[PDB]
Design goal:
mainly alpha, protein binding, 61% helix, Death Domain, Fas, 12 chains
């Protein structure tokens, strides 16, 4: 299998420029997330008590889908958080590369 | 045991489109709730001071029955909050699937 | 000790159907209350500024005696507020069960 | 479901230019409102004591129907408050977009 | 000595379907617990800072009695947390097998 | 030294049946407390932001004297909170056992 | 430096017997206060919305000077609130001990 | 920028000796005020319902210009309220210090 | 991308000299804000209950646009709050530097 | 390089006698701070959820400049918090020793 | 050199009856400690993440002075934590034996 | 190949005077790092549980690039952490020597 280069590249981008992604409440990211589960809520709760919002920040991002590809679920949360600029950045870097099923 | 798929599915729905469920006071949800207890009141109080209304919002939903199945107790609170549309959404997604005792 | 099941059961009832208990002024409940203290007045004052009359409503109920058993003090306030129906409801559910000292 | 873009857009408009909507008494908005309930009266009462008329102003608007779509109920209150200009503004922005049942 | 097969079997059950046991606050489990000690409070505190609520969750279960047999103390906490279904599950699997003193 | 068995026994009792001790405001317990210090106020403040009123509840109890023996300081706070029943429970279990200086 | 034992001792006294200090309006304490600043007004405002008058009560006391020694500023407010007895209590306990500059 | 020391100093003075400034109707201060706006009228209205005339008193003072420097607008209102003594006090403390544009 | 140095610089300025920005009601900032949404109203509500007006103050500023660049939306709110001086300060520091699209 | 002995010495002093530094709101220290950044706000937020105000207290002090030398930035915050005594203590111990550029 | 028998003896005592020493916050022990350094703060931080408060408890005790003799620094922290009994225990066992410089 | 003498020399410097580099959160170093990968996040996680922040501190430094030359990536993280002095120290010692491609 070919590891989604866009997911990893977009992963480090959000983690590096996180300072700009911290201008929103975790709500618009975890509960606001279309598909969710109770088990996921408890998971983030643990990370919260772990250290702080920083660990809960990046952790949540990966927690959204618990697997690579959460880029689409992320951009969605942005669309609902009035994050027009942030939505374009993530959607652009991801759209820059995509696999094709033969 | 078979985990209520409707409870989980309906759980994420309310949490995602919570923006529309925030058009009502927590009163119609916690005190207005038919069966309640003092211990429950103190619990939500804690979550209130925790961070804000957001955490108290989703937390309350799960706090209503403290266990899966609060969908019926929720729709009830809606019927008392003049929430006709909200009551149909939750009651529909839940009625879409139900177990049968053989 | 056996927790007064009537107090808890009657507690949730008043909290759920509070919509009907909101047809009276807090006066008939706090000052009108036979036994009272200055400290109690200041307490409710705090809850008032907390959020609104809703929180001050249920809070006052528990504030009346600050402990379980305020059912008798409540029904009394009703008798003085011309609340004949309300007095019968609370007095009935409570009279439905009572402990006996052996 | 498609969130009423007109309701949200009209919501921020009334909230921004509220300075002009404050030229009327809350009466023409809450009691004057065709369909109403006692529970609603107590709700606004709470917000009143919360802080002031400002919070009670915007809160009442959302309290009118407790759900999106109160635009029609609002314009109605305007028609009864001799608010010809205000009625046209709200009725226009809303009429600018409407869903169709296929 | 015969290791309580019910304690171990019930132990893995609670740990596997913990997702459903996470619908309650740790309060109803640690402080609410009938017999407790200060030393126990500090112990769980340590596990809390260890990683998160997950480790503190399962750890607390074993911390309740610090020894096998906490099944009775657990079901008790459930009875006080309005956990009727959870109380039946644990009480059933345990009652399914019990030793007899000859 | 002999660890006050009454303090520990009374400690778990208040923590287990805390549901009944939550019918009072923390004020009657921390500020109302005869001997107090500014440093103590800040301590509880921290626990408040920690999680909620639950942690601040039990924590405050131990914070009252920061050492075993706060049973006398507790019963006092009860006497000032009109807690006649609660005062008898704590004062009884404690009076049930006391050391004697030879 | 030697921490003002009178300030701390007088601090707990006012906080314990606060029930008697609650017989006056916060006005005679904050605005009536000789030296004041706008920044201070906003601070207390925050505490007000925090929980209630209780937190705003003790908080204001410390907010008066934001530092130990507000005993003189407090007794002053009492002199202006017709609080003769209260003024003597605070002024006495403080006068009971005072440092001397060598 | 240099914060107007006269505005702050004069601010606390009016707030402390407010007892003497309460000998006039709010009219001579809000409507009588030369430059005013409808939005300002609604603002004070909110504070009025907030608690009482006390909060509306000091609040109005800051509401007059919503920014530091209202000392000139205040003294004006005094000149129109026959407040000769009050006008001299405020005008003196302010004239005691003034900035110069180089 | 080049992080708006003006937004950050202006951000700390408003946060440091906030004492002067606290001379206005949050209304002129949140509801008065041209473009707004219901979801935003609930967000600030949470911060309100969090601690006080202080946290709600700075939080609101960032909440206005939930992203950098709210300087234009802020200055606007000032223009509507009769804040001539405040409007010039923010508009000046921002106009001091601006990017150009090649 | 020569490690600022004054910074370390003053660091332990503030941390030891912190009990006196806890008489002020974190606002006068973090937002009130002249030069600040959004990234810094999020950092302290994390520490807040970490444990309580205690950790956020000392952490904030070091967070002010994230590097040794924040003594000047600290004393500044004191000057704005009406902390005359506190400002002299920190400014004195620091002025007691200073390096000279040859 | 003669190894301080009192330090070792007192070391095991605090470690054995630690259950009673856990009734205080680590603050009164590490930051409250008169002489401290930044390097020490980071050290304890590491132990914190190591396992829990238990390891951080005993570790901190030895971390206070990083060398034998911290008994005096410990008793000091107790004097500031209102720990009268604890202060006497440690101060007594230590005073029971002391070296003399010939 | 010629082993980067600057990397090794700068490596020991940061490790020796680490006490000053511990005045920043690991966030500004790992996530904030421009180019990053998920695999790297898990690696540091392991070191975290290994012993403490100390091991995670130096380990992270080498983990940033997993190979010599991370000096440029380090100085970058400093520029984003407001570390002006730290950035000059590392950038200077490194710039003191550099290879040239013939």
């Amino acid at each position: 299998g070919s590891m989604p280069f866009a997911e990893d590249k977009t992963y480090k981008y959000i983690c590096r420029n996180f300072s700009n992604f911290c201008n929103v409440d975790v709500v618009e990211i975890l509960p606001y997330l279309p598909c969710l589960t109770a088990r996921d809520q408890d998971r983030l709760r643990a990370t919260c008590t772990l250290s702080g919002n920083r660990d809960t920040l990046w952790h949540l991002f990966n927690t959204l889908q618990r697997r690579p590809g959460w880029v689409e679920y992320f951009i969605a949360a942005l669309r609902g958080c009035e994050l027009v600029d942030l939505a374009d950045e993530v959607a652009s870097v991801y759209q820059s590369y995509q696999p094709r099923t033969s």
